[PDB]
Structures are given as C-alpha cells and as structure tokens.
Amino acid sequence: STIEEQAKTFLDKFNHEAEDLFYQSSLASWNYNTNITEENVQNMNNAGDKWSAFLKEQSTLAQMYPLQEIQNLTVKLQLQALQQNGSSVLSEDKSKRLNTILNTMSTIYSTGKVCNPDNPQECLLLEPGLNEIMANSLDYNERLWAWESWRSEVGKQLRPLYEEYVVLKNEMARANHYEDYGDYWRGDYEVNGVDGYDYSRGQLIEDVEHTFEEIKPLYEHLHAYVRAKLMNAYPSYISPIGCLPAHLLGDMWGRFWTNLYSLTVPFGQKPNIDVTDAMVDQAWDAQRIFKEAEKFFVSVGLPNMTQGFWENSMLTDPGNVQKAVCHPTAWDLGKGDFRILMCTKVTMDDFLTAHHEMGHIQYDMAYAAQPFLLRNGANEGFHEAVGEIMSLSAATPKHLKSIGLLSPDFQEDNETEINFLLKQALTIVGTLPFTYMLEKWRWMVFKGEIPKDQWMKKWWEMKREIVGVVEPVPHDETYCDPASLFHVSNDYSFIRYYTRTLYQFQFQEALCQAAKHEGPLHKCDISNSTEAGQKLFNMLRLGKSEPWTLALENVVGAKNMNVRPLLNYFEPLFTWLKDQNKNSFVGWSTDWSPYA
Amino acid sequence: ASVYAWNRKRISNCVADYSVLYNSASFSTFKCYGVSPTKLNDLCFTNVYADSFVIRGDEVRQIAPGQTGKIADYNYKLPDDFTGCVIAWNSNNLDSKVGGNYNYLYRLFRKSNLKPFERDISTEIYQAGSTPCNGVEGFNCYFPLQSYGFQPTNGVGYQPYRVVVLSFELLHAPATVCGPKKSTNLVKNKCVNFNFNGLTGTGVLTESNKKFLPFQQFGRDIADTTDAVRDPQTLEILDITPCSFGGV
C-alpha cells in the first residue's frame, strides 16, 4: 500500500521489457555499421523507431509517481531518468522541427567539398579530401582557401537553420523546469538527495572556470613555445608577437594538435619511439594486436573477454562490396553481447586504439549487474576517460619493452621523454582550451544573453583571449564556422571532453600510487598490479547507481573534480618549457596586430 | 516447460545409469547437494521425481538449497537439506532463435514466498497498491508474467542453460531402484568373498548340477547355510562351499 513498493514493481517490469527492445535496436544498428544495403537503413530505423516510441509510453506512466516520499536512492535515480519528457512537451507542429533539422544538419556535414570555385577539377569526401590538405601541406595560401572551403561552403547554409535550432531547443528547459538548454546538459553532473554530497548545476560553471587558472600557465608556455617552431615554415606570414592563425593548428578547428608534432619536434636527430616497423618484421595480424591487449587487461585484474566476441565481431575491412564505415567505436548491445567496431592496421594509433576502444568494453560489463536504466557511466566524462587511461599506459616505453615491441636496448635520456610527452601534450593540453571555449560559447548562446549580431564578435574575441588564435580573415555574422564541428552539429555535449582529461589523470595518479611505482607518472605502468585493478574495478562496477562524486572518493579521495594530478604529469615538460621560453614573448594580450 | 510450469514425473522400476553423466564431457553445473556422485550409486533413495525447466546462466547459482533470491523465491524454491543433485548444460544450438525466444515465461511478483516443491498455475495479477485492479492495467496492476528473450548472439552470462533437478529422499517406501553397479570379474574354484543382493559370505565358486526355479535369488541346504546362488546377470546356477580349512 506504499508508492515505494509500487515503483519497484514497475521498474522490474520496465527492465525486462526495455532490455529486449534495446537488444533488437542495437543488433540492427550493428548490422547497419557492417553491411550497408538499401533495406538495412530502413531495417535499423524500424526497430529504432519502436524503441524510441516505447520510451514515450513508459515516461507518461512514471509521471504519476510522486518523488517526495521515495527514501530509496537506487530507484530515485531510475525514476528521474525515466521521467525525462524530452520531445513530448512540444506540440505536433514543433516536434517535427527536431527530426527534420537534425537530419538536415547531419546530411549537410556529410557533403565533402574541396572543389575550387571557377576551377572544378575534382573533390573527394572529408576523410580522403579534407584530411590530406590539413595534415600534410605547409602552404599558407591554399590552407587559407581550405579553411574557407568548408567554413564558407558548408556553414553558410546553417545560419537560418541553426539559429532556429537554438531558439526552440532552448524553450524545452522551461517546459522541463530547467533554466536553459545549456543547463539541461549539466543535469548529467547534477547530484541530489544526499546530504553533503550534492552537486549543484550552476556550481559546475564555477568549478570548470576555477580549474582553468592553472591550466592557463601550462598553456601560456605551450603556445609561446609552439610559435617559434611554426614560423620556420611561414617566415614572413605570422609575427612572433601575437597569436596564431586558425588554419595552422593541426585540425580544421584546431581541436587536436597531433599534426604539428612533425613540424615542432624539439630534437629530431635521435629516432623517435616508433614500433610500426617492428610489427611488420614479426608478421603481426589483427588477432595478435588485440590478443596482447587482452592479456594486458587480465594482468591488471580485470576479467578477460568472453568467447562470443572473437568469432563474432569483425576486425579488418571485410569483402569488397561492404562499404561500411569503421570508425573506432565501442558497442554495448546488452544481454552480455559486447562488440568492437574498427578497422585494424599495423600502426601506432590502431594499436593504441585497440587498447583504447577495449576500455569502453571493459567498463561496459562492469555495471552489467546494474539495472538497465543504471547501465551507464557515472556521467558523460567517465565513459570516455576510463577508455583513455590504458592508452596512456600502453604508450609508455616500459610497457612497450615488456611485450617486445620496442628494442631491448633503448636508453631513456631527457629527450626520449620530452619527445613522448610533447606528443601527448599536443593531443591533451592543446585540446583543453578549445573544449572549454566552445562549451562556454554554447552555454551562453543557449542561455540567450547573446544577440543575433553578436555571435562572431563575441565568439572571435574569446577565441583570441582564452585559446589565443588570430583570425586569418575577418568574418561577419553571416559565417557559421563554430557549427562546422562534428559534435555541435549532431547534438553532442562537448563538455564531456574537458572533464575527460581531468578524469583520465585523476585515475592515473590513483592507480600508480596503488601499484607503488617508484618514479614519475610518464614512466608508470598499470599492468602486473592486482591492487590497482581492484581499486579501479570497485568504481567501474557502480555505474550510475551511485553518484559520480562517490566514484571519485573510491579512487582519489577528493569529492570534487580535482585538477592538481594533471600538472604533475607534465612537470618534466613544464620545467623545460619554462627554461626554453626565457626570451620568447610568453603570454598574449588581445592581439589585432597581424590582421588589422 | 517453463520455470513456473515445471513438471514432476516419478522415475521408478528402472535402473538409472549415472556413470554416463560423468564422462559426458559436456556438463557445466554437475553438482550434488546433500549427497556425493560416487556414493549415490551403491545406495539409493526412492522419490526420484525429476523437475524439468530452463534457467538462465546468471540465475543458475540462485537455484540451490539454502539460497534465496528472485527465481528461488517467486518461481521455484528448493527446500533446505535438499538431498539431490543439479545437472545443467548449454542449449544454445536448439533452445534459441533469432529475434528472441518468446516461449518461456516466469513469475516476477508474488504476494507470498512459494512453498518449496509447489507448482502454481493461476492468472491472478499482483497487488502492489491498495486499490484493486479490475482486469485493466493501471498504476498498481503490474501483470507479472514476462517473456524471456534468448538470441544466438546473447552473451554466455544470460545464455539459456538446459537444467534438470533430481531429488532423492528416503521415505517409508523400501524396495526402490538404484544406480549402476556394473560388475566385477567372477572367479571360479577360488576362495573369494561374495555379496549378492541380500546375502554375503565366503567360499569356493564352482558349477552346479542342481536346477533353480526362475523366481529365486539363492538357496540353502541345511541349518540356514547358503550353498547355491543364481545371479540374475548371468541366469546361471552355481554351487558354493567354504574353501578348504583344517587343523594342522
């Protein structure tokens, strides 16, 4: 005769009904990503539509559940997630603007165009067309055209579409009793109902900004250092007194600076840590690449992979007619079914991606005992940062010499670590200001205190201040270059990548202290330590059933999002960068110098 | 049948060969509770009722005496001190289909715990709240019946394992059927211990000229001294005498 026993009956009914429907949709989506036919797109959408419509019926039934008397916390978190109305609050004339706009945005992003205006020779897709002009060439004139080949040919048609998108997605928050749509994405980090453990939605803006005043002095010296080794390819085209152009930062958007490693190597005379040539001497294949990753995990203490994955998943590119994309993604089909979807290669990245993409799988069966609504990560940053802590460990020279990939006689001097640490700094430190700035811009435009004519003059003036990028060409408000990125166009919360770095290094210091490694964090290893495996597995198995702030106290002992155990990873790099920047102009103000 | 419709059929008047199970090389949960696999062959108990049902891989551990849970509490409860064995094996090749095997159902909610060795067949709906349900699903009806989903691609954890339960209890009924005690190597003209069904002794085994009727097991001549046995595996009558002895 209590609502508490009535909710446990309903959640027990929903868990068995949803996991049957979710497995059919996940199995249909797996076949779409392996064997593309004309009917397979309709076949996946048929099962995926009835799964989305199933949640519409269950959300209305759980609404009549009053929350003010449920003392149990396991079902309180389940009822809060199940009762999210989402698109049910909108009218029929307004709900049709979601699926129409989002599929037009995705189709627009799928159009690859590098054909020159008034010179129509040929142009390929994004991966074969756009990536070669950004990762290999060192010419300023065509890269400026290539910067304008996508930000003036794809983003020009999004202004009437994306501004209409940010005025109706913003209205759901008042209908869902949220502040704005930027506040809606912070509900994943929101914790309520526990005394002293509560995480407010508005304190997260402050905590991200509070951790940024020590990221900045690392990024101040990184940007100062990288501007002296960039003017070698462009002598008279950039001044070493201001900021950097946007089309010279590794990517089209400057998210990852991995392609600047070849241009800005400190001391390239001694050979780098490269074992791509080592695997082709020993005849490595797709099976042996993932087999050494599996024995790496069981040496830590995690359970090994099941027998229904090696003979069931695909590893290479199969056949000739199957033109399916094999971007490295982790699949959680449920009911004990776990798959990895990627194309294997004997390279540095694919060997690390083999370790990286398995970690999301190793996180997925950990909360397999949890109910279906709690069968997820603690937040959006846990499931990405867990899959990357083994990528830091697998790239260490100690782990590479353990298997036998590296040479048995490889000395470890100063520069053998600065070359490795600076490669990690361009892909980790360089993406923190880009991730924070874009989410700060998206949060305020979702708040609504940014007029229509002030998108670019505020977006560009903060890119110049925080990130430190001079615009290669001035742009008015009709340009829409911030919407060109993959995550912003497909409705992905990008704040999960800023907290990914701050999580993947909080766990690294906790696991290295558990393994009792004598040395710095760059040479540390996780394998051959069952004490570190048991420390990680206790927090992986919790899932969303416990608050994420309780997951931190199980590994690091700090209930807040700690940023201190990330500067300690780059202290060998940071102390050298402070000595290298004795005469360079470190620290930029606002700089309209090059393109006034 | 389903877990909530487990059958109960008596096994009697026949020999149950438990040796073939040991060398099957396909079992995964061949465990015995309250008895040993080796010592249930020489001696046996009546009431060999066998229960047939399908239990998922994750819920195999729930099916054990002295252990509670969901299946053991609302579907089929094993009584404490259950002197029997549990035998299970995988049935993925046959007890599975694409799209979900919607042929096995189970009870998810019950007002009271199931009495051990009770089979319940009813359409009564659960009463989570106070307001009665009049057959129309509402906020407190919660139709407990649900269909399991088994697929060939399902993980080993939830793989549908074919499991059978054998019970062995010694009630007031004697003269029951036991397991296999195949044979030893018979020896003739040598002082050898013999223990047939109901009698034992020592002596010399040799051929006999006398004839026994087809409804006896042994015989005696004088002063209740056994001197001839007719073993049933050979259908032959033999003569038994104590082996040579005397005072030197």
Ligand SMILES: *[C@@H]1O[C@H](CO)[C@@H](O[C@@H]2O[C@H](CO)[C@@H](O)[C@H](O)[C@H]2NC(C)=O)[C@H](O)[C@H]1NC(C)=O
């Ligand atoms: C982790 O443990 C494994 C298992 O002992 C180590 O593998 C051994 O490596 C040494 C030399 O590298 C060999 O002589 C042994 O034969 C290996 N053992 C086996 C079972 O193959 C591995 O080196 C350890 N790695 C670290 C970093 O400690």
Ligand SMILES: *[C@@H]1O[C@H](CO)[C@@H](O)[C@H](O)[C@H]1NC(C)=O
């Ligand atoms: C794979 O796709 C091709 C055409 O794209 C189709 O003919 C074939 O039947 C498919 N095979 C499987 C196993 O899906």
Ligand SMILES: *[C@@H]1O[C@H](CO)[C@@H](O)[C@H](O)[C@H]1NC(C)=O
């Ligand atoms: C909530 O209910 C579950 C049901 O098993 C129980 O395990 C858990 O301890 C309960 N939590 C609280 C705080 O009562």
Ligand SMILES: *[C@@H]1O[C@H](CO)[C@@H](O)[C@H](O)[C@H]1NC(C)=O
């Ligand atoms: C979802 O929509 C229904 C229909 O109006 C409404 O009663 C309910 O309060 C909404 N849920 C939330 C959380 O606002």
Ligand SMILES: *[C@@H]1O[C@H](CO)[C@@H](O)[C@H](O)[C@H]1NC(C)=O
């Ligand atoms: C996983 O480890 C267990 C324990 O040693 C072993 O029995 C099993 O065969 C292993 N499975 C695989 C696929 O390696």
Ligand SMILES: *[C@@H]1O[C@H](CO)[C@@H](O)[C@H](O)[C@H]1NC(C)=O
């Ligand atoms: C690193 O640099 C310092 C400063 O010159 C030097 O003393 C030290 O020997 C170097 N380390 C190695 C391993 O050469």
